[PDB]
Design a protein around this nucleic acid. Sequence first.
RNA 1: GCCCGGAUGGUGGAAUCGGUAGACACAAGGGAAAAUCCCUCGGCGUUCGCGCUGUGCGGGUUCAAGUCCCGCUCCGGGUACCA
Length: 811
Amino acid sequence: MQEQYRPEEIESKVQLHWDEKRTFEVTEDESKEKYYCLSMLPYPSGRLHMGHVRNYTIGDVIARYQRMLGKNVLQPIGWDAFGLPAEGAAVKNNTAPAPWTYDNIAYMKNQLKMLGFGYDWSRELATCTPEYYRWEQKFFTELYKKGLVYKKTSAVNERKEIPQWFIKITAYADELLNDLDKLDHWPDTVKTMQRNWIGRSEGVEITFNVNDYDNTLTVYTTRPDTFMGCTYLAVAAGHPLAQKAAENNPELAAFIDECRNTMEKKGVDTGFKAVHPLTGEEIPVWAANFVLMEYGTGAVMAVPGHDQRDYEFASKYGLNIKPVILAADGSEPDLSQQALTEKGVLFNSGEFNGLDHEAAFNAIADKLTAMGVGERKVNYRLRDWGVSRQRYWGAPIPMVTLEDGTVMPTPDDQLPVILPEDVVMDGITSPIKADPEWAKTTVNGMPALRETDTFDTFMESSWYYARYTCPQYKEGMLDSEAANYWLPVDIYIGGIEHAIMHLLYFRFFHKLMRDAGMVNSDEPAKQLLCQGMVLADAFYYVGENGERNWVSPVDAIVERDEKGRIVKAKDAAGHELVYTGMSKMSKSKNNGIDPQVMVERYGADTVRLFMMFASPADMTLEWQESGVEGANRFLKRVWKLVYEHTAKGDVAALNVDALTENQKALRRDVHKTIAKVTDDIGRRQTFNTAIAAIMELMNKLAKAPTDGEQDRALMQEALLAVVRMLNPFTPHICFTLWQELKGEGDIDNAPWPVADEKAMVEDSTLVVVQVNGKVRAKITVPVDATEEQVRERAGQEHLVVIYVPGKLLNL
RNA sequence: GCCCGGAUGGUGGAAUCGGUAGACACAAGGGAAAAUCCCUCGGCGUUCGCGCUGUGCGGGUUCAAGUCCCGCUCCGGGUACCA
Ligand SMILES: [Mg+2]
């Protein structure tokens, strides 16, 4: 055994070994309990960032630990490889998105190996290859044939009316919302975000006649109980009613054009009068900047007495404000300053007077419904999923338009529709749109023009978790047996910022696949763990020109007070720096830290250990070089204790019967430590305290004598235990130390240590004696003494009723 | 302005159970320039044994609150008129 620990001499040999033995490659083995540990797949930007390192170290810790518990563990890796950055890099360099992307995959793959992540590399996928995207193209054709796909012009952000393909995600909204109650092991924050994003709404559509106007006008309301307080209707700027009025009304015309471009209220009277269906009285119709064209019908019944936006519009333009709901105490409301918003009992409402809110809602709805001018309607904030982009670097959309004018899917025997990778980019137009020949094809015997827009990249990320189960299956999108063996994912790890995009889409996609017969479960992941951001100090100076210039913390020369807080700071050019604290990492604050640099400076194991020790997985992590150094020193001390132990040669069989009292207490701490680290990693997922627990045991182990045969036999049992406990975190050093300790086989398939129950029995326990809360004594008592026995030993104490067994007496 | 989180030593963080506050580590300081190693370290008071105090500020429950409830202050993050 070398005296010095040198990761440059250990890590790449161990990595090569994991590749040569295919250590982390797995199959669908029915004789073992499965565990699917998934980290959000990287985008191949060019190099790993510290967030990848954190995300993927947490997943690797869990994957390795679950393998040591005897489970069959799937930990897959792949590349979300289409998307926008590659077209910008292609143009800037003078290349193409494909070769740039594949070069990045190669470089980042080598980085992930250099971190020692135990992936099943046989299942590696890059989502830009036709072997991947072909199945989403087929799947999109099936969705279309099932009526879940349509095309429409919609406003994207300046503002454009762009045609797009939509998947009807709203067909599944109820279930996406309802099934959140199944998600016990997702965090409350992500669930609430999804609930609010979905925005389920129960209401009524109400249709109005409109004088001297060709069509009726339908509004959506969530408060039909306030119907007799409706003093005007309001319509979105883009509504066809406003469009019409706008032909004779230049005031309106300019308002409608103002709105197309650009929380104040703004509006123009359209001059149209709608007829109130109950009273029969005319009310004015206004165009209003606060009504969304895209939601509901894009028109509202305005009740300024009881909706604050309607109140502020009516106050500004002098429209009638009419009260129809009473205050909590049955008094008429004070509307002199703002709307009365709470649901109450109606007044000023004729036949509907005295009705409470639920009764009012129902009665006014029932009456409009029977009059043929209302109907109950559930709406959603959630929009349908717009899946097309006017971009080149993505999966082609499998639709065609025949010479006819007719629209249909690309035939089965013409899938995949292949994105050509050999292209020159002009910056301006997609190569498959710039070339008129590419879109020309033939379908059902006739000349067609095929779609040139491509899929948004969330299309590929919505199902990759499932394809990892059967990545080389050529017969379909999924081998249902393989997918149902591995799914649902046991734990999915990735940031909270994906909460209402990817983390909603993959739930939807899972359900589509369920309803196609492809999987047999309702949800794709049991547990979601959202790891915190990695932070770093940030500094700037102000130039003579008044501009802020940000300076990397490595270039900061800081000065620290008596208590170590930063009091001044300068750069080597002499600029006075202002310290802004720990801050999210960015190129803008110039405070990013390159994990490659750190891996080369300290070794992967040090970087992994620091990242798991510094803070709980779900909280923010403050990157501190003094902290990383501290981790490196710990591993060096573990290396030292093993070197000195093995230097003494082989070990006698431990004889538990003949152990000394000290020996017995020391062994007790080995086994308690095993029990805690197990519970911390396996159930609590408190990785930082699991490590602290190992460190506290080492501190004792470094003190134990090791001359007598038994002392050494005990250290052997301790160190075999420590090396295994540390292995999910620091597997390179631990792989090597296991061999030095002559552990059996490779550490990766060694059994996780189990605490010996015999080793942990206490002869005695300590009891704190308090008088009136404040501690006045401490006493040792048998782990079997009765109250009165305990309270008697209590009484005997010269300084010395509530009693917790084994813990506390308070008098 | 909304919805959802936070607040413990000089610092990151422990306290899982309402029951010994500060494990573990960093930073300091003392020990045998740099590096390693070993001991001290919440604040104040001290006759060096210890005493009083202490979890942003208030209050409620409790025999007992960092923990559970309710206010106030101050810190972060999402969401842009969804009728
Ligand atoms: Mg603090």
